[PDB]
């Protein structure tokens, strides 16, 4: 019954010319709802879900202003970090930032988080209590001390425990028809011979939301991981997700095998067996 609102920011320097490429995306759970791309002509935060199009011009003006400010921070950071790390001006580098808040089933603040990476590695993060920082290396210790002096954690916590949660609750209600609906996986099994004496059984989970799922094969009631294969969970493109898991078995012994599906949209896990 918990939900999250999360923002993802990526800035990539362009050493040959110009300012960094900056992309921001916002999500509720596994649903993207807004974006900003510095390479787009609008230079505005833009809607990506129908329920956020309910918001009026003042929303779009404020989100645009704030996200452009985030872009400038990252631009400064890329220059600073090049100096912290004694790097050349010739390479392209990347800053990534993710932050967000969760509410529980009681619709109250549950947890917050704020993470920052440089060149795809941890740089600095808020600790779980939202009151102190984890610095990954000695460069990040500079940042930690600067941020402690300027009481940055308290400022972030104010948003994560306050405004952040208020937005999430507004979005959940406005987008209830989708954001608060679970789509249980549509499941089925296929069978095909791989020889005159063996067959593959493939268990499919389709059209499910949210993305978290578990598919497990069993033989005579116990977990079977040998002779199995799978794919990583993947987006269908319509907002739902897909996954499959397969096992090779002796022909004629199919009935020994069961595929077990766990998903939050299922009141109890499903068990599938071939004919």
């Amino acid at each position: 019954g918990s939900h999250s609102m999360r923002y993802f920011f990526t800035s990539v320097s362009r050493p040959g010319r110009g300012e960094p490429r900056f992309i921001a995306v916002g999500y509720v759970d596994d649903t993207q709802f807004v974006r900003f791309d510095s390479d787009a002509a609008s230079q505005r935060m833009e809607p990506r879900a129908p329920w956020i199009e309910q918001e009026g011009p003042e929303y779009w003006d404020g989100e645009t202003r704030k996200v452009k400010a985030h872009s400038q921070t990252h631009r400064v950071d890329l220059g600073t970090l090049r100096g912290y790390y004694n790097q050349s001006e010739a390479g392209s580098h990347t800053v990534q930032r993710m932050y967000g808040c969760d509410v529980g089933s009681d619709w109250r603040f549950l947890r917050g988080y704020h993470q920052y990476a440089y060149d795809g590695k941890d740089y600095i993060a808020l600790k779980e209590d939202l009151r102190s920082w984890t610095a990954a290396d000695m460069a990040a210790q500079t940042t930690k001390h600067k941020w402690e002096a300027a009481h940055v954690a308290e400022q972030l916590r104010a948003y994560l425990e306050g405004t952040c949660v208020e937005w999430l609750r507004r979005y959940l209600e406005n987008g209830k028809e989708t954001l608060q609906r679970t789509d249980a996986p549509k499941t089925h099994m296929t069978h095909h011979a791989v020889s005159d004496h063996e067959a593959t059984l493939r268990c499919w989970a389709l059209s499910f939301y949210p993305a978290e799922i578990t598919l497990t094969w069993q033989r005579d009631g116990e977990d079977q991981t040998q002779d199995t294969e799978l794919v990583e969970t993947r987006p269908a493109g319509d907002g739902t997700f897909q996954k499959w898991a397969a096992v090779v078995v002796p022909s004629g012994q199919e009935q020994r095998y069961t595929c077990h599906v766990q998903h939050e949209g299922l009141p109890k896990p499903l068990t599938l067996r071939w004919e």
Binding site: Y7, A24, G26, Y59, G62, E63, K66, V67, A69, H70, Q72, T73, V76, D77, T80, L81, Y99, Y116, Y123, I124, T142, T143, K146, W147, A150, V152, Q155, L156, A158, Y159, T163, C164, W167
Partner: peptide, 10 residues
């Protein structure tokens, strides 16, 4: 809605 407080650089 995005963070609405003061921005801080590394």
């Amino acid at each position: 809605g995005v963070y609405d407080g003061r921005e801080h650089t590394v």
